[PDB]
Ligand binder design. Structure first.
Ligand SMILES: *C(=O)CCCCCCCCCCCCC
Lengths: 41, 855, 66
């Protein structure tokens, strides 16, 4: 990926990266919102 | 110096279907800084004009020469709505790309002017501004040229650039009308880009091309597509694989070599590999005991000997001063590594100086003209020996020059022997390791038994030797073999005057007679003999039945050029190309006295079955064929083998292997073997294939279609050669009009006839390899012998830029190419000019005699 | 503005879902683990050629970690 002579990014295919799927870190973004209109007034 | 060199590859149905996933990936240190430094340094030092101009000229010329079989003509006609995407202004003041005006002017042979051009780009000035990679409202063009930078949009990496390339390809795909064509530029050729191209564009064209003009050591590439929005089954092929292989290899080598020169505009003080050494004496004194500068000059001589050393004597600030200048190189400083004491110099040459000489200004790269042929040939020769010698090898060199180049080429721990006639000049008493010299002949007898030695050499010597003694090449070779027979050597290197292909001639440089086995060097003024490959081979087979013989190839390598750049020997492209061509007839023989033999069985011509039987092995062993440092095939996988034909059989009775092949490229292939479940590699002998004959004959009927359809004639040609035509104007090759002659299929050529064709000769030339006209340069003397009518209408155009005035039975009518010319009422002009230069129109003259006289 | 913004990413979200779902990036209990070179070498082996990750890697990675 490195498009520059000097790299100061995050080597995705580099070493030192960590992959530890844990229960405490169960992924989610924004499944649903309480957009009920009675509660929205 | 010199102009640019162009490389191209076309699609062929016949090749092996290579997939997208096994083309060479780009190097990964390609962005690490020192490489960037090398690319900067090479580009700064390039004698050339407007790069965007020359590249675009090259690509347009090569684009007007791609035919549709479905309709027998170019996909590139004239009047085509042409979009120039990326119209960089160029700070030269033209405000536009510098080829558009020459294009429409038709000031290019082979490139008919178009209808119009529309200039879109970020830095356009005469067109319109937009960022192309995203949609923008426009009409439809028939041809779309691209010169878009991709190191600008998208941040500094390679995947964003990969996405830019797909965006550009789709945008161009949309801009062209159905049946059009487009060229795109690629900054970084990476694998997934061709993955995308293969699964997204290839099934939507008719033919494609790849093109690479070489003006700076980079990886820029051009990709050309034809017949947009028409379905086919085009996929990558063998030639693409080989081309990419070379297009990466050359780059890697040149970058390595370029990474050693001192920086552009540096300060030489002695630590740099290449520097302008110089020392001066104020008020010199020579006659009496000096012991002051007698060491002073001698130190510099030992520093940079064997390289041209220049002097000046003048006066500065009242003091009479002498100055010495020269240049240091790795080889020059390698010679110093071999001395123990310091050799000293006789100054008698200098105190006699009674004249006055102005000093000068140091220039590192001194040459202003380009390196001469034969010096480059000698360099490309000596790279082989300098590479092929390791440390400690006991060396016996024959033909050794008096200046003893070898003392500057080999490591400083290998003993050497000078075997020549003229006395040398190199010293005697300062040599740390053994070094001997001789005054005798190496064709002579009774001197061999006393001399140790492992690698025996002879370079640019034996042909002159045979010529001098009035001796033939056959006898000279056999006598050299005889002399080496009772020796103790181990490996032999010999330059040999003997062809490697179809016999041809290099113009003005090496003219070859096929009656007597003789070469001629005109610049050298001498007639020498040669012999033939098979004739020589048996002689080597005789004295050594264990002789493995190989013919090391050079006419693709560039590593040898490192023997120039590192002492500032300026290079020209043409001087390179002629060196390869000259080398195809002065090859180098590498003979191992105890290698494993290889016997040539079938007929070794392209388009013909070949056969080899390789004894002395086991059924669990492999062979690999290389070609230009590529890999034609290996035995383990017979099938996915990149050559047209493979076979593999084994004789468990005798342990003899058998490989029975067909090739498709003339030149040299090399077979190497792999023995055991180990990474160890053996090097078996190489072999040569040669192209079919260059002979041509043609049939000319008696009736001549002076109409538009035009007469059609038969040109008997072995199909391997692909053919076009040219003209020589002002000593320069111009591309004949594709609208004038049409090849098609036996073979038949179409032609529209004209009076103009009487006063210009026409050549059929060949473009299949990188070079043109090397094999077939056939003038059409029959064309300059036509018998005109008088009862017939005629096509007619001017011959050239000169001033021809017409005459009907010796009576001037008007004047072609004249200021204030007026068209006759009975003449008439034709839609598409038959001329060799698109600018000059073509008229219709009514029946009569027409004579033109030069003025 | 919100609705039209969410319209644009209608595909990029799908690509990220593919990336997180092709192999288990969540576990019920405790914690599991696997070397990053291996899993990355896997993704460059199964994601479809049209997936946006192939052309926009670092942002995809940082979004994943987000
Ligand atoms: C760095 O050298 C640029 C090329 C390598 C980038 C990584 C591979 C591209 C795709 C990102 C990860 C692979 C899985 C999608």
């Amino acid at each position: 990926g490195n498009a520059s002579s000097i790299v100061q990014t995050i080597n995705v295919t580099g070493d030192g990266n960590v992959f530890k799927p844990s229960a405490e870190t169960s992924s989610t973004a924004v499944p649903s919102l309480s957009l009920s209109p009675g509660m929205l007034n | 110096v010199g102009d640019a060199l162009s490389y191209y590859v076309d699609y062929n149905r016949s090749h092996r279907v290579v997939l997208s996933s096994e083309l060479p990936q780009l190097p990964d240190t390609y962005f690490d800084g020192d490489e960037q430094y090398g690319r900067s340094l090479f580009s700064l030092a390039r004698k050339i004009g407007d790069r965007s101009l020359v590249k675009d000229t090259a690509v347009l010329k090569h684009a007007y020469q791609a035919i549709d079989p479905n309709t027998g003509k170019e996909y590139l006609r004239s009047g085509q709505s042409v979009a120039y995407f990326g119209a960089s202004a160029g700070h030269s003041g033209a405000d536009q790309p510098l080829v558009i005006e020459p294009w429409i002017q038709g000031k290019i042979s082979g490139v008919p002017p178009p209808s119009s051009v529309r200039q879109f780009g970020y830095d356009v000035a005469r067109g319109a501004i937009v960022d192309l990679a995203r949609p923008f409202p426009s009409g439809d063009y028939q041809f779309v040229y691209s010169d878009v930078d991709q190191v600008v949009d998208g941040h500094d990496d390679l995947s964003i650039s990969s996405g830019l390339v797909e965006s550009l390809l789709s945008s161009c795909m949309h801009a062209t009308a159905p049946g059009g064509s487009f060229v795109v530029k690629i900054n970084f050729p990476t694998r997934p880009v061709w993955h995308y191209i293969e699964q997204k564009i290839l099934p939507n064209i008719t033919s494609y091309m790849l093109i690479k003009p070489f003006v700076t050591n980079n990886v820029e590439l051009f990709f050309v597509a034809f017949g947009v929005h028409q379905h086919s089954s085009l996929t990558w092929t063998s030639g693409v694989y080989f081309f990419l292989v070379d297009h990466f290899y050359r780059y890697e080598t040149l970058s390595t070599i370029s990474r050693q020169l001192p920086s552009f505009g540096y300060v030489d003080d002695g630590s740099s590999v290449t520097g302008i050494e110089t020392i001066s004496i104020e008020n010199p004194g020579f006659s009496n005991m000096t012991q002051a500068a007698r060491i002073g000059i001698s130190g510099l001589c030992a520093n940079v000997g064997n390289a041209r050393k220049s002097i000046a004597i003048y006066e500065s600030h009242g003091a009479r001063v002498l100055t010495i200048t020269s240049r240091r190189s790795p080889a020059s400083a390698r010679r110093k590594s071999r001395l123990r004491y310091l050799p000293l110099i006789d100054p008698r040459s200098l105190e006699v100086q009674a004249r006055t000489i102005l000093p000068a200004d140091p220039v590192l790269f001194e040459n202003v003209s380009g390196a001469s042929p034969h010096v480059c040939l000698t360099m490309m020769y000596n790279f082989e020996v300098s590479s092929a010698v390791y440390d400690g090898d006991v060396v016996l060199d024959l033909g050794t020059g008096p200046e003893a180049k070898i003392l500057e080429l080999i490591p400083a721990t290998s003993p050497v022997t000078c075997v020549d006639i003229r006395p040398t000049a190199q010293p005697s008493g300062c040599w740390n390791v053994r070094t001997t010299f001789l005054e005798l002949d190496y064709l002579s007898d009774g001197w061999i038994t006393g001399v140790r030695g492992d690698i025996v050499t002879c370079m640019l010597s034996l042909g002159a030797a045979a010529a001098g003694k009035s001796m033939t090449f056959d006898a000279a070779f056999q006598q050299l073999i005889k002399v080496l027979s009772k020796s103790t050597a181990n490996v032999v290197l010999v330059q040999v005057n003997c062809p490697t292909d179809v016999v041809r001639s290099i113009k003005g440089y090496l003219e070859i007679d096929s009656t007597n086995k003789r070469y001629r060097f005109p610049k050298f003024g001498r007639d020498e003999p040669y012999s033939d490959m098979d004739a020589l081979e048996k002689i080597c087979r005789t004295a050594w039945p264990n002789c493995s013989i190989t013919w090391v190839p050079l006419s693709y390598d560039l590593r040898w050029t490192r023997l120039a750049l590192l002492e500032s020997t300026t290079l020209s492209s043409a001087s390179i190309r002629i060196a390869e061509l000259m080398y195809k007839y002065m090859p180098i023989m590498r003979i191992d006295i105890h290698g494993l033999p290889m016997e040539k069985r079938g007929n070794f011509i392209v388009g013909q079955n070949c056969s080899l039987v390789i004894p002395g092995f086991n059924a669990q062993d492999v062979f690999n064929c290389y070609f230009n440092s590529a890999l034609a095939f290996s035995t383990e996988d017979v099938n996915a083998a990149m050559i047209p034909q493979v076979s593999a059989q084994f004789d468990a009775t005798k342990g003899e292997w058998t490989l029975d092949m067909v090739f498709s490229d003339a030149g040299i292939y090399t077979m190497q073997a792999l023995v055991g479940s180990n990474a160890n590699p053996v090097s078996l002998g190489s072999f040569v294939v040669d192209s079919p004959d260059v002979d041509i004959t043609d049939a000319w009927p008696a009736q001549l279609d002076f109409t538009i359809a035009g007469t059609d004639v038969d040109i008997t040609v072995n199909p391997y050669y692909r053919l076009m035509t040219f003209v020589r104007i002002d000593g320069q090759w111009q591309i004949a009009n594709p609208d004038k002659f049409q090849f098609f299929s036996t073979l038949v050529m179409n032609v529209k006839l004209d009076i103009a064709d009487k006063y210009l000769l026409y050549y059929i030339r060949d473009v299949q390899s990188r070079d043109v006209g090397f094999y077939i340069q056939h003038p059409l003397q029959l064309l300059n012998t036509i018998t005109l009518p008088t009862n017939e209408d005629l096509f007619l155009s001017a011959p050239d830029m000169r001033e021809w005035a017409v005459k009907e039975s010796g009576n001037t009518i008007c004047i072609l190419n004249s200021q204030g010319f007026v068209l006759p009422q009975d003449w008439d002009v034709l839609t598409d000019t038959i001329s060799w230069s698109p600018s000059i129109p073509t008229y219709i003259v009514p029946p009569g005699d027409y004579t033109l006289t030069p003025l | 503005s919100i609705q039209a913004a969410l319209k644009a990413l209608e595909k990029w979200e799908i690509d990220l879902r593919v990336a997180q779902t092709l192999l288990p990036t969540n576990v019920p209990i405790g914690e599991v683990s696997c070397p990053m070179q291996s899993v990355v070498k896997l993704l460059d082996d199964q994601l479809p050629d049209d997936s946006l990750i192939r052309r926009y890697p670092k942002e995809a990675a940082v979004a994943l970690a987000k």
